[PDB]
Design a protein around this nucleic acid. Sequence first.
RNA 1: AAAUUAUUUUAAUUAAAUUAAUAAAUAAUUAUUAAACUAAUUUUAUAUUAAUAUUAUGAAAAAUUUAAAAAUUAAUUUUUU
Lengths: 138, 275, 179, 98, 178, 139, 117, 150, 178, 195
Amino acid sequence: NLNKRYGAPYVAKGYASLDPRCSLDAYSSFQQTVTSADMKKALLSIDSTSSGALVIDVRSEPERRLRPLLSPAIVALHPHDILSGAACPILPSNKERAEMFVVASEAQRAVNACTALRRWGFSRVTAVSVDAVSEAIA
Amino acid sequence: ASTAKGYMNRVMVYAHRRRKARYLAPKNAHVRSPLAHKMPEEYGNTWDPRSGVEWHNRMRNRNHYRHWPWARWTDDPVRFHQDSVCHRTVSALSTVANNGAPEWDYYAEVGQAYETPSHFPLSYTAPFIYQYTAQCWSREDLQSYLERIEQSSGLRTIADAASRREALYTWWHNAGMNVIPLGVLQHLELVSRDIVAQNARKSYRIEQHERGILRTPEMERYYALPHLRGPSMPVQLAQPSGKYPSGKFTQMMEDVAIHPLQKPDARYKHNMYPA
Amino acid sequence: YYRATAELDRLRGMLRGRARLERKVGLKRITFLMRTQTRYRVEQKAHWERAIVRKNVDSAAHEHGSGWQHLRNDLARQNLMLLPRTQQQLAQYEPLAFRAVMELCASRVAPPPPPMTAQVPEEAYATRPEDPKVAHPAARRQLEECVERMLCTGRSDVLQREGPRTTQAWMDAWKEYDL
Amino acid sequence: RYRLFHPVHQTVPFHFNPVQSIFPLIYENNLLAKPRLSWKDYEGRKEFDADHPLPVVGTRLNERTTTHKWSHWDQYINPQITQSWMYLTQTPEYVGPR
Amino acid sequence: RAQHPNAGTRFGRVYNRGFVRYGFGGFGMSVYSSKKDRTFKVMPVPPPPPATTAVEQRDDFADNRGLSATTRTLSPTFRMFALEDGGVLVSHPSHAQIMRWNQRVHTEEGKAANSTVMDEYVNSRIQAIIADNTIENTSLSQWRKAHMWNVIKSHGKLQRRWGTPDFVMGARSTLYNN
Amino acid sequence: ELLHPLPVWARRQQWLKRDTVEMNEAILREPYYRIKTFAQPAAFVSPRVSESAAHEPDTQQSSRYGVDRQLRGPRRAVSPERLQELREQLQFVGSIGPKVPPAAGAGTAYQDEYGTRLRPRYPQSWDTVPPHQPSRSEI
Amino acid sequence: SYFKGELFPNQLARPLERLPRGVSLAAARKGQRPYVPLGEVAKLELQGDYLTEGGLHQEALEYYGVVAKAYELAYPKDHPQVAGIRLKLAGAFRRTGRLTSSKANCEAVLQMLDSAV
Amino acid sequence: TTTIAAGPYRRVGNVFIVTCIDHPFKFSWEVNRMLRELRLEFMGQTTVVPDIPPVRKRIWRVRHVVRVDQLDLDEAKALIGIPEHISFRDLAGQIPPTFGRGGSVANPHMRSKMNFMRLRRMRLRDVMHRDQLEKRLLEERHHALQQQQQ
Amino acid sequence: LRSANPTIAKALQPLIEGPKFAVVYCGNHQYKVSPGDVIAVQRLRAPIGSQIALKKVLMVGGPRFTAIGRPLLEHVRVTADVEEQKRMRNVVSLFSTPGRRRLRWLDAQHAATILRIREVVYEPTVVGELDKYDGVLLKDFHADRHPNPVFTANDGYDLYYPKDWNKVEEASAFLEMM
Amino acid sequence: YSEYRSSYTGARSAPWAAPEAAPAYPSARSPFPLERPRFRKTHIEWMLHHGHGDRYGKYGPSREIADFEYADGTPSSISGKRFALKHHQDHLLVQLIRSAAIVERFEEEELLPRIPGTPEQRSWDPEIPLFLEDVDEFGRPPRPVAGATYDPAAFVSDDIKKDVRRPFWSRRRWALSDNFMVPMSPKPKNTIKDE
RNA sequence: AAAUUAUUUUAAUUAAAUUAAUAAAUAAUUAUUAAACUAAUUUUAUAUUAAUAUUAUGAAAAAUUUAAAAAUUAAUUUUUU
């Protein structure tokens, strides 16, 4: 005689609180764009004397050797350290005010890593540009 | 509780047998069952059930299977544990040449995750080639061999060194041959024919994952719904309800609410004198 | 098989009629009535006997409007640690002191905090430039926190001064053995 | 109820055994290791002061002993004690009859 | 018959009380069901006093309130102080100051119409407690009526059994059972 | 035999069971580690995601405030370079190997003063219990 | 889980080796209570040993000082235990070179041991 | 502060504190095997196992038996008062390897011959001591004799 | 006694004087101990006729106060003297199951030292008055005023409230501290 | 004299809040994070919470503090069972230090996998998301512009419906309601695999 | 078939197959005596053996499977000092 002791958020609960909707919104941010100004605002977040790297690149370790972008001290996270939740101890506190970015080799991984973020309670990230952040050297 | 004089003399109130070592495996011996003589993860292997006494005599080192894996690892019938790289060389200066020869494939049978796409330069297959050729060339030495190849020869990419193994060697013969030990080359050829192979197996694995084959990281099939492109509940595809559609209004059985001003159908009771 | 007869042979003196006269029926009786006590006593006497003590303190907590259902849990709240066998001595022989425990739990007084695990004295994070004659900042930290606590326990003769006794010289009581 | 939910972090309380117990000089950085290796190695009770001697309240390992017969070593050392044929006890390997 | 150790209960079979119930499986042995549990179950809780505080005196599983809500009577007398160790020093009125108070409440209890012949009896027993501590409880009475006989058998060595050397005092001291 | 029904209190205290296991396997799918930074606080609040029904906030009369007192507090070893600034001061007194005695100011070693087998005469007592039988730690 | 220590004859209360009755120290050497929280200093005097065994001799000197002060208050003159601590104390100076007081504080334990019985 | 923290990133493991909430004698021979590899047999026993991978399976198989608790290592270096700079691979490098019940060798005989020789290398430690006194006195009795004739 | 408030130690001092019972904790057992009271504790390796102070003390109460020491009280001295160091009455466990032919007469002599307490003194240190019903240390302490004045719990809103005899439902807590 | 330590270092956290301020009571709701049953700490969760074990005389200030002491102050002796406790205390530290001297090793050689959960476990629980990287989990990405949402709540209705009585109080609705399956009388638990 | 005489102890367990003008014999178990530390992991955890002694054919509650079974049969985890 459950749901009398436990709530309705029992038995009628799709304990899959992971990704019924976020994955979609991940493919939404994939669609719009990211460009210079979308990095230039992040440049101001690098211009902010408080240095916490904004964008992160989820790319294989041989890839980054080929096009090194590590210049502004941005964070290089293996895409599982994001998915698995091992990266939350280094992730902004303001889940609703922060928007980092996610660079990736091919834009499928980026959105596939940014959906992991939005599963971790993060709200804004437009989630890709492998080539812009190099054209925005900063 | 009910402890009574000694380790393993705990609860002593349930009637189980203490001092019985429940951790130890059952001596299944003669009994025939898939659960025989198998570490519990190997229970699914019902095609090689390990029942029978001889499997009891040889999993445990019983009578004459007393050293059972009569040929375990640490014997090689072929090369008897001596490295097959000739040190007896004509000139002592060139003894270091043969170092780094491939004794087998070294790259395909292991199945490493070479995440290098086949269009990278050659200098990015050095971290793989090394792990099998240390004790032959320092890591920073390879990056002197795996660059003179890129500079001197017409080969640049992992895909090239897999499509031009003939054109590469002929360069090495007529241009290298004094610095780059051909050990590197046949190692360089063994990875470039793998990185190219795996990328074909990855690029295919990604190209089925769209066509809907959907296998997990460990490659077991997992069936999962496709993404929605239209309305979730079917409308022009709906199957008829399946229960005789005598609506709630043709036989006002229940669940029907009507304003009291708008009471219908009393043509003999109270609609004959409507208001 | 040894029936410990000479350990029972003189103890039939307190059995009843037929058992005392004859021996093979006298033993058989006592070596059973004994064999059931030491089985009743190990597994059954407590969970009966410790229910008189619970029925006592309860109905003695019941006099003060609280139950055992509430007292047994409102004691462990206050970290008070009085075994029930003791609360039964207080329920009877010290009624006021018991109701004191009663009126304590019902009170909204903050129970004592759980004990703090060991802390890291911050001198471990400085690197003493090692001079032979000066103590490490973490020792004279530990010491002062061990001497202030030795002056804490019991009225003694040790530099007997009112309230807090003398310390800054107690830490340097080695020079008093120095030449 | 018997399904207690607590931080099992609570059931091995380290309030009394922090690393200043086993490593007594760790806030002193020299990191010395002075543990108690086993219940076996316990040397025994020892008077902290000589003025309070530990009492002699015997146990089933003292109050219940027997007179020392002479072993074949005590008769090999000092043959001045094998004084009767009841001292020529058999080989030590012969434990006794079945 | 296959007489092998480990084929059943090692030597025969016995039915101790930890078996007749909680048998193999815990659901109990078929026969020898078990004795009914004739212990003394504790009684259920009294009702708490009415609220009239508006402090959420009703809440049961809250951090502030200890479970028991016992604001009974001359509890304000049990005015407690906070020690140093974290303890408490409860100053209460002594067992005489209460029985002497109880007399006052009781002596003005039955006097309104007529103190009954039992009401005169109680104030005597009450006035007998302040003076002599004439105790009325079993725990001492059960103890004293016996402890005297037990200690007089000592002063006057009415043993009849002087040997009793802890082997014969073995059964005794256990055929008694508290 | 199973004749009369399982008493209700048992079923309820067995629904707490599956909701214990449903709380173990929430622990057994955590990442094996946590990418952390040196400069930042140790655990500023930084728990797992165990803020479903968060308790004991009171910072005292809380079980954890012997620990998170120091975690949330500013981390002293604030950089990998600061670590060697701190790790280069600790010695190992008993470890196997050679040493350099005059590294201190004027200390003269002990084990080469009372020999290797002799131990200082520790005052044996209830509270103070020293290691017993020291000649059994030589493997 | 906690396993209580086994009983074994290696755990007897051996007697502390007393020099015989009709003999005093120098007879051979010249031929060649109040409540004092001893529970608190026994733990302290131990913590001195761990420091003189580790190599923080100067820091162990300051502890043994305290123990040399509580011990001479609890036990009377001539006592053996008060001779035990001003003995290790004398071994604490010598690590730190103060041999002026080390030998002196150690020559006094003899004049504190011989005068005993 | 709206920024992914920037700094040299250290990773910290986890340490599981495992207890036993269900009796072991109700379960299988494999589940009892896992509990044995977690140093857990009796109800109420408690051990502190690491979060390494092959432990994660052992604990997983017996989830219905134990009650786990996870600690990040920094949340362990404070549960026991430990300086942040001292790691644990130097704290353990101090305790002897022969801690109580040193090894777990393949059967209680091999255990009883691992404790035997351990009680021998004590005998030999005093005997290698008692001759090293003689070998030095013998090498001196030789030099006293040798130099005697000069 | 000691205190931080000079007026507390004036009113609380006359309470501590008198015979005091302490609830010691010796040998994993608790005892209620009066000064000239004799207890039988599990064997403490102590000589006979030697003084002993018992460390763990959970409670000390006198005729009028009672210091409910949360888990343990410090600064209290309950010293005692060992009289006997002996094996109390021996209770034999006769162990034999009715299956096997084998008996085990296990004589469990219970080694127990028998203490006679001498000194039960208490040196508390009161911080401040503590109001029971909302625990906060009070600034000022007045001997006469009850910090938690109490009121009859009969609102009149119910019919089935049990009205005891109208002498006890109309009562006050006699003011004792003055 | 009595003593109260509660920890190896003493220095108890102040038991009293403030000269008059609020007293900061402890959390008295059992840590069973669902929030619906709302349990209470039960004596044993309030003995653990105070730093004993689940029993009174285990690990607690009731086991560390001496049984007694010679009234002059000369402390007790090392009870043969006491030492075996100090070894049991040290055996927990070393159980913790070793079990972290292994972890502080594994992260050094990268041996700790990045995918959380053993291979067999991850096949068992569908909440650890598959660790595909360069593909989408459910096959093809939502190529169609989503603005593509299915809400379980529209069509999936889990309503605890009251099984309504066949209304006998009205004549006609009793006859329609006469679901002609009242011949459930063929429900004999008959032999389902024989005749 | 009925018996087979000496308390306070100090290492655990079951097995179920080849055969029988149907059980003194064999495996497997148990037992007595004795053994040597082969990659696999934690710094985890592990009764594996040899040599002899051995008058045994049938496994609670489950999970199922034969059989009119109306239980027997297969099954396999229990099996209290």
